[PDB]
Amino acid sequence: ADVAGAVIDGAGLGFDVLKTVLEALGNVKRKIAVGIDNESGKTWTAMNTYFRSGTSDIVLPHKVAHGKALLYNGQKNRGPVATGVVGVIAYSMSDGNTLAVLFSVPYDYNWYSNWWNVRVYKGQKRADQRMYEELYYHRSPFRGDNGWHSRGLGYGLKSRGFMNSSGHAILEIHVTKA
Amino acid sequence: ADVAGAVIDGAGLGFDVLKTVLEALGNVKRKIAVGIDNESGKTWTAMNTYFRSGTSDIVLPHKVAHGKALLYNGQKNRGPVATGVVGVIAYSMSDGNTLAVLFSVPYDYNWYSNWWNVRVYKGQKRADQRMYEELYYHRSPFRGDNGWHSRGLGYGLKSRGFMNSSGHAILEIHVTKA
Amino acid sequence: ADVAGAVIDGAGLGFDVLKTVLEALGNVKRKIAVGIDNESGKTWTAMNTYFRSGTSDIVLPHKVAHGKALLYNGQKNRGPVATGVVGVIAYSMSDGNTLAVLFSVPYDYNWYSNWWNVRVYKGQKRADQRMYEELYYHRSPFRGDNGWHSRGLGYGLKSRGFMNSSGHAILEIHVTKA
Amino acid sequence: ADVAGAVIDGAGLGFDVLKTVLEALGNVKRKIAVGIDNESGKTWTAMNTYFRSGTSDIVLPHKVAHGKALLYNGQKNRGPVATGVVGVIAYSMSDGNTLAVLFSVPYDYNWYSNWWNVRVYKGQKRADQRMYEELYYHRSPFRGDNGWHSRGLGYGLKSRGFMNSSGHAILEIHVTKA
Amino acid sequence: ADVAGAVIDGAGLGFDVLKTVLEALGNVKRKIAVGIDNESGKTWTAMNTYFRSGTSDIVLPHKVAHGKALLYNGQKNRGPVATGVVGVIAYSMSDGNTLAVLFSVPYDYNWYSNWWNVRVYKGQKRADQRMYEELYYHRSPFRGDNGWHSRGLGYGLKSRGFMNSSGHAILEIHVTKA
Amino acid sequence: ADVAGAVIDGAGLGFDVLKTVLEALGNVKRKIAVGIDNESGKTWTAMNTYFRSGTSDIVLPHKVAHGKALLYNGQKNRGPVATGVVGVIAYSMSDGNTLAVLFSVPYDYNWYSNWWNVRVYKGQKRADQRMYEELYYHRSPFRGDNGWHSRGLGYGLKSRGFMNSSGHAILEIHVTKA
Amino acid sequence: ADVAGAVIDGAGLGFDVLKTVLEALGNVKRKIAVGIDNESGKTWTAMNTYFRSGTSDIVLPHKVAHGKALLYNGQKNRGPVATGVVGVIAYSMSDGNTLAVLFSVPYDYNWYSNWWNVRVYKGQKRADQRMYEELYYHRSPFRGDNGWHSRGLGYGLKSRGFMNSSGHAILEIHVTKA
Amino acid sequence: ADVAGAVIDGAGLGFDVLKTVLEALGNVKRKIAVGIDNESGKTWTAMNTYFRSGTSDIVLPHKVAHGKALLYNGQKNRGPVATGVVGVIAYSMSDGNTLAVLFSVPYDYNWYSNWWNVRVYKGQKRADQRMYEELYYHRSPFRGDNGWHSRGLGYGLKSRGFMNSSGHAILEIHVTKA
């Protein structure tokens, strides 16, 4: 019929529009490269990385000795999903405390920005949703604003970090004795 | 006729939709890379790898001496099938016991997660569906949550492992004397 | 006419469907890589490879001395045919007996699996359909199940082999003195 | 209907036009490469880079010693947005003052040109919107007109710089003792 | 008209079908690689290669000394023709006799197989249709069945050859003193 | 409607024509490579390059010592604009005078040709529109006619240059003591 | 109109058919590679190559000394023309005579074959149409039949040559003292 | 309307035909490579190259010393124009005379052939249209007929040259003392 033919043409147009929209959604790239230098005078032992958003394809390096650096990366989930890569990295230190690092590379830059944070926790604490919420909402995170930021960590330690503002994020932190 | 022409147009649209759906289903990647370090003090002899889901394209290495590592990988079946790569690797140890390792990289992440497990069985036991069910449902598997996990294996052995959370899974285990 | 135009549209749709189906049938890959180690203490002289299904593009190596290995491969027939690569390799040994090796990589995995077998025949026997049927139906073949299998061959010889379960099959056999 | 078919055809034409327009808007390239030579006799420590428009994918180098150079680059935001890369780089100098550098590579060359500026601020001042507005509107910026420009900076320093006029901008500055 | 439009549509469909058929016919590959080892104790001088089907792109090597090998190849005619590569290679030997070698790689494997033959002719005889017919129909050719075959040639010589069964044919012969 | 359908077909045809025309306009290449040898006995210091048409992607080299050469290039603006690359290069000399070099590579060769000129100005004069007009209209420029041209520059200097006639222009000038 | 629309559809179909036919005609390859060894004891000086059909892209080597070889090639005319590469090569010898070599690689193998000829002419004679006709029709040319042919040339010289039968022709000739 | 729809279809067909015709016209290649060996005993200084048709992308080398060679090339104008590359190269010699070389590689081989000429002019004469007309119409040019040609130049010089007959023309000349 003429009605049926119009329906098929409309459905074909909708199919092409849907394919284009899904391809566009799936081509957004959000990834994070993390580099942390250990000058704290103690060895770091990896515990876990809690991903609020996104995932990683590699192993979190088990040991970071003093004078060495941590290399890690992650990215958003494969496919046409509108989420970024957000998470916290937790490392156990020889003193018995935990070094926690937040990163946040959002999908939607109309509402969100890049954020990062560094904090030392007393005792051995694995990264989870509660730790991420603390570091993102209550512990004064740093904006990924192409700037350098310094802050004392307590426990005779201090941090100095940098994060850019684009969706190809890179986070670089130096942990040194205060 | 006009009815016949509409039928042919609808069939053509359905053909295009089916081709796109099959291509999307067949482009999902689920693979596992396994690396196990042998520091147990004994030689491991391969028995078999039971695949609940998926397959492998390579040989399970026959021997893993003390101080050496096991390299192995697998992936989901070729084609537009909605299954992952799930299985158990069994190795015979010089003491007469079996080292069994579980991996699970599901196709559908709406309902499933990455899981892994390590266990030592008394005697020589080949990997099968029963062993997989034990390791996956009853022996407290570890989640592939980008975290490090440790557990005593018995028989004077202990394990320490890591697995990420993405569909390009990597599993790394260290078996050492306890 | 309107009837004639509908016929031409239907024939064009059928032509596209046929092209897609033939391309899909022709893209299925079934191949076998065979590696056999000779530690039997005697020299192997190639007789023939009987292909129940499929073919090979290379020469069957004429001699395999003790301490050396056989490299051979085959694959299914070119084109959109729904057959695999199935055959038996026969080598003459210095004692006057025949070493026969079965491989089977089927096209349809809904009904068939990978199979392999190793057997020593008295006298010089070339691989044919009867030998293939013996090795596949009556001599207890091993499943290509990503596992290691051992069996005494008689005549002071033993075999140990491995075959994976995918359509990119690899078969590895070690023939040693018992 | 005939009205409905016309609507679907018009919508398809509009869809093609929209795709072409978005692809054209997204193919415009605006990037800046900055190189600043330090011959001032003092060490420069990076503070931040404020981006009025655009972003960067790399780290602002933390230190620039005397006799060394600064390498930095940026570009406009990914996607079909009609903005360029505009910003200010601020470095802290050993005397306690700030070296501020402006770059401006606009999207729309019908109305804007390439601009740059160099200025020394008393005290440690991070780059922000106010600093950018000062350098761009009130401190006599130099045009990116493929010409060399020199100006005394005060504090016993002078600058000499060059910037081309295209959308693949390169800015080169030499800061020397006056 | 409506009749004329239907004719043009049918002709276009037939044109597409014809292009697909010709492309399929022209993508069939039939080639032969010949290697003959000379251990006869005499020098071979090339006479000619008669091609019943197909052709060659290279020169038939003029001399093959004792302890050396002959390299030669051929293939079916370019274009969408349904013929293979079939022919006879004739070499003159130092004793005044002719070494004749048959190869046959058919286009249609529904009806034909790979065949080869080796024979020594008294006197100097150039390869022609009669020689090909003798070798193919009356001199008991060997099947290209992935097997090794041996036969005494007379004149104190013997041959041992191998040919696979696929359209990428390879023929390997060793001519030695009997 | 039938009128509305015709309008949409006409608009689609016009869209395709516009895309082809814009692509053709944007594929015209006009670029200039400038090489000037300094044998004048004095050092050249770059002032600026005034572009009447086109732009450059590189830095104008700040110094050209005696016995060295100047490498510079430019090209027309990116996109489907119908303009070439036309400009004047000005260098300050050690004697206090200015060496000015004109190049002109037009977009439209139906009306314009390649032109170049070399002149020495008294005092330090930056290249601008007035200098370009002098060199192009009033100072007898040389045609880019694949020929060599010589002219005394005054101030004890002479020039010898060459320019080809194509849209991939190259200008080579030697400035020597007269 | 309906008549006018049918005419436009027919013209479009004819346009596609013409494009396919021209592309097919232009994809036929006919080329010749000539190699001639000079063992005549005298130096060869090139005169010319007369092309009855086709052309060459290279220089005919001016000198061929004794103990050296001639490398030359040609091919059919570019474009969809149905002609091959046919010609005669003429070289002047130190004795005052001309060495003439014919080659013929036709476009249409339904009616023509590959032919070649070698002849020595008294005096210095340049290759032309008459010489080509002599060598092709009256001087008993050799068929390019994948065979070796020998013939005395007179003047204390003899020739031995080979030519294959395909459209990628190669001609190899050895001119030696008789 | 039906008339308007037919007009739009005819215009679209004409657009496709025009695009194909322009692409075909623009794919014709006509280029010349010139190599002249200087054994005249004097230095050659480049004057210019007058292009009757076509252009060059490189510099005419300023000096050619005795015992050296001239490398030069040219080609037809970019775009779908039906012209070749035709011109004259003029070099000033140490004796005060001019060496003039003609090349002509036409676009239309239905009516024109490759031509070349070499001549020595008394005094210093730049190549122009009159010189080209002399060399092409009145000074007996040589055909680019894949042959070697020699001619005394006067002034104690002689020339020997070669030019092929295809659109990828190469001209090689040797100028030696007579």
Cα B156 to chain centroid distance, Å, stands at 26
Q: Which of B13, B17, B166 sits opposite A57 (nearest CB)?
A: B166
Contact C131, C144 (CB under 8 A): no
Contacts of B47 in chain C (CB under 8 A): 147-148
Phi first, then psi: what are they for B124, rounded to 5°?
Answer: -95, 110
Rounded to whole angstroms, the Cα distance separating F48 from D164 reads 10
Rounded to whole angstroms, the Cα distance separating H100 from C61 reads 68
Task: List, in order of start, the domains of chain H with CATH numbers.
Answer: 1-178 (2.60.270.20)
Contacts of F64 in chain D (CB under 8 A): none
Contact B151, B127 (CB under 8 A): no
Contact A119, A139 (CB under 8 A): yes
C-alpha neighbours within 13 Å on the C-beta side of residue G136: 21
Q: Give me the count of residues in chain A.
A: 178
Rounded to whole angstroms, the Cα distance separating G75 from H118 reads 28
DSSP conformation class of H60: P
Contacts of F129 in chain D (CB under 8 A): none
Contacts of A6 in chain D (CB under 8 A): 1, 4-5, 8
Rounded to whole angstroms, the Cα distance separating D75 from D84 reads 7
| Residue H94 annotated as binding site | no
Beta strands in C26-156 (DSSP E): 31-39, 44-53, 63-64, 69-75, 85-93, 98-105, 115-121, 142-143, 147-154
- β-pair type (G115-121, G142-143): antiparallel
Interchain pair E164, C59: CB under 8 A: yes
Q: Which of H6, H20, H166 sits opposite G57 (nearest CB)?
A: H166
Rounded to whole angstroms, the Cα distance separating F42 from F66 reads 6
Rounded to whole angstroms, the Cα distance separating A105 from A123 reads 28
Q: Which residues of C touch E (CB under 8 A)?
A: 1-2, 4-5, 8, 11-12, 15, 19, 46-51, 55-60, 62, 77-78, 126
* Structure-token pair, residue E12: 């276009």
| Residue C111 annotated as binding site | no
CA distances from F128 to A85, C44, D116, D154, F132 (A): 52, 88, 20, 30, 6
Longest CA span, chain G: 81
Looking at chain F, which residue has its C-alpha nearest residue H6? F6
Rounded to whole angstroms, the Cα distance separating H147 from H113 reads 14
The alpha carbons of chain A give a radius of gyration, in whole angstroms, of 21
* Structure-token pair, residue H109: 């081989």
One-letter amino acid identity for G71? L
- β-pair type (G147-154, G69-75): unpaired
Rounded to whole angstroms, the Cα distance separating G70 from D40 reads 69
Contact C171, C103 (CB under 8 A): yes
CA H14 to chain F, closest CA, distance in angstroms equals 11
CA A60 to chain B, closest CA, distance in angstroms equals 7
Looking at chain A, which residue has its C-alpha nearest residue B32? A57
Residue bearing tokens 């969408």: E80
Cα D27 to chain centroid distance, Å, stands at 19
- β-pair type (A31-39, A168-177): parallel
Q: Which residues of E touch G (CB under 8 A)?
A: 1-2, 4-5, 8-9, 11-12, 15, 19, 46-51, 55-60, 62, 77-78, 126
* Structure-token pair, residue C117: 């077998």
Q: Which residues of F touch H (CB under 8 A)?
A: 2-3, 5-6, 9-10, 13, 16-17, 20, 145-148, 162, 164-168, 170, 172
For A43, counting Cβ atoms within 10 Å of its Cβ (0-12 exposed, 13-18 middle, 19+ buried), the class is middle
One-letter amino acid identity for C54? G
DSSP conformation class of H107: S
Query: How many other C-beta atoms lie within 10 A of the C-beta of residue B44?
Result: 23
Query: How many other C-beta atoms lie within 10 A of the C-beta of residue H2?
Result: 12
Interchain pair C166, B4: CB under 8 A: no
One-letter amino acid identity for F127? A
Phi first, then psi: what are they for E143, rounded to 5°?
Answer: -80, 145
DSSP conformation class of F106: -
Contact H41, H65 (CB under 8 A): no
Beta strands in chain F (DSSP E): 31-39, 44-53, 63-64, 69-75, 85-93, 98-105, 115-121, 142-143, 147-154, 157-163, 168-177
CA C111 to chain E, closest CA, distance in angstroms equals 26
Contacts of G5 in chain E (CB under 8 A): 5
* Structure-token pair, residue B28: 């999902």
Taking alpha carbons only, the member of F127, H101, E74, G161 closest to residue D148 is F127
Residue bearing tokens 């191998």: E162
Contacts of H2 in chain F (CB under 8 A): 2
| Residue D134, H or E segment | none
DSSP conformation class of E55: B
Report the structure determination method: cryo-EM
* Structure-token pair, residue B14: 């359905």
Rounded to whole angstroms, the Cα distance separating E178 from H143 reads 64
Query: How many other C-beta atoms lie within 10 A of the C-beta of residue D71?
Result: 13
Interchain pair B5, A2: CB under 8 A: no
Interchain pair D19, A17: CB under 8 A: no
Rounded to whole angstroms, the Cα distance separating B51 from F103 reads 72
Contacts of G77 in chain H (CB under 8 A): 166
CA distances from B45 to B61, B125, B131, H121, H138 (A): 8, 12, 18, 92, 93
State whether the Cα torsion H63-H64-H66-H68 is positive or negative: positive
| Residue H21, H or E segment | helix H2-26
Looking at chain F, which residue has its C-alpha nearest residue D167? F57
C4 CB-near residues (< 8 Å, 6+ apart): E6, E10
Rounded to whole angstroms, the Cα distance separating E150 from E161 reads 6
Longest CA span, chain B: 81
* Structure-token pair, residue A112: 């969100």
DSSP conformation class of C155: T
Cα C152 to chain centroid distance, Å, stands at 22
Rounded to whole angstroms, the Cα distance separating F98 from G14 reads 66
CA E2 to chain C, closest CA, distance in angstroms equals 6
Looking at chain A, which residue has its C-alpha nearest residue B143? A48
DSSP conformation class of D82: -
Contact E34, E70 (CB under 8 A): yes
Q: Are chains H and F in touch, 3+ Cβ pairs below 8 Å?
A: yes
Rounded to whole angstroms, the Cα distance separating E97 from E154 reads 11
Q: Please, what is the angle between helix A2-26 and helix D2-26, to 10°? A: 20
Rounded to whole angstroms, the Cα distance separating E17 from E2 reads 23
For E141, counting Cβ atoms within 10 Å of its Cβ (0-12 exposed, 13-18 middle, 19+ buried), the class is buried
Taking alpha carbons only, the member of E33, B113, F172, H32 closest to residue C57 is E33
The alpha carbons of chain G give a radius of gyration, in whole angstroms, of 21
| Residue D72 annotated as binding site | no
> Virtual CA dihedral for D38, D42, D48, D54, nearest 10 degrees?
-10
Phi first, then psi: what are they for A27, rounded to 5°?
Answer: -95, -5
Strand partners, B35: B71, B172
* Structure-token pair, residue G159: 């020739």
| Residue D159 annotated as binding site | no
Query: How many other C-beta atoms lie within 10 A of the C-beta of residue C47?
Result: 22
Phi first, then psi: what are they for D149, rounded to 5°?
Answer: -135, 145
Interface test with A, best of D2, D20, D48, D89 (most A CBs within 10 A): D48
* Structure-token pair, residue F9: 């077909």
DSSP conformation class of B1: -
Contact H156, H178 (CB under 8 A): yes
Please give the span between the terminal C-alpha atoms of chain F, in angstroms, as a whole number: 80
Contact C51, C128 (CB under 8 A): no
Taking alpha carbons only, the member of D40, D1, D49, D47 closest to residue D177 is D40
| Residue D84 annotated as binding site | yes
State whether the Cα torsion G166-G167-G168-G171 is positive or negative: positive
Taking alpha carbons only, the member of B116, B61, B124, B111 closest to residue B85 is B116
Q: Give me the count of residues in chain D.
A: 178
Beta strands in chain H (DSSP E): 31-39, 44-53, 63-64, 69-75, 85-93, 98-105, 115-121, 142-143, 147-154, 157-163, 168-177
One-letter amino acid identity for G72? Y
- β-pair type (G31-39, G168-177): parallel
Task: Give the residue ranges of the annotated binding site of A.
Answer: 30, 50, 52-53, 78, 84, 107, 112-113, 115, 132, 136-137, 143, 167
Contacts of C48 in chain E (CB under 8 A): 145-148
Longest CA span, chain C: 81
F37 CB-near residues (< 8 Å, 6+ apart): F68, F69, F70, F173, F174, F175
Alpha-helix runs per DSSP H in D27-139:
129-133
Rounded to whole angstroms, the Cα distance separating E87 from E74 reads 9
| Residue A91, H or E segment | strand A85-93
Contacts of G23 in chain E (CB under 8 A): none
Rounded to whole angstroms, the Cα distance separating D36 from D100 reads 11
One-letter amino acid identity for E11? A
State whether the Cα torsion D3-D4-D9-D12 is positive or negative: positive
Taking alpha carbons only, the member of G97, G96, G99 closest to residue G70 is G99
Contacts of E8 in chain C (CB under 8 A): none
Rounded to whole angstroms, the Cα distance separating D89 from D48 reads 6
Taking alpha carbons only, the member of D152, D149, D51 closest to residue D104 is D51
Looking at chain B, which residue has its C-alpha nearest residue A22? B24
Ramachandran area for residue F20 (φ above 0: left; ψ -120 to 50: alpha; else beta): alpha
Q: Please, what is the angle between helix G2-26 and helix E2-26, to 10°? A: 20
Rounded to whole angstroms, the Cα distance separating G26 from G19 reads 11
Interchain pair F6, H5: CB under 8 A: yes
| Residue A5, H or E segment | helix A2-26
Query: How many other C-beta atoms lie within 10 A of the C-beta of residue E63?
Result: 12
| Residue H78 annotated as binding site | yes
Query: How many other C-beta atoms lie within 10 A of the C-beta of residue A113?
Result: 13
Interchain pair D55, A165: CB under 8 A: yes
Rounded to whole angstroms, the Cα distance separating G119 from G121 reads 7
Taking alpha carbons only, the member of F9, F143, F28 closest to residue F78 is F28
Q: Give break positions in chain G: residue before each, C–N beyond 2.5 Å.
A: none
Interchain pair G170, E48: CB under 8 A: no
Contacts of E11 in chain G (CB under 8 A): 13
Rounded to whole angstroms, the Cα distance separating B173 from B148 reads 10
Rounded to whole angstroms, the Cα distance separating E154 from E111 reads 33
Rounded to whole angstroms, the Cα distance separating F153 from F176 reads 10
Contact A42, A93 (CB under 8 A): yes
Residue pairs between chains E and G whose CB atoms are closer than 8 Å: 65
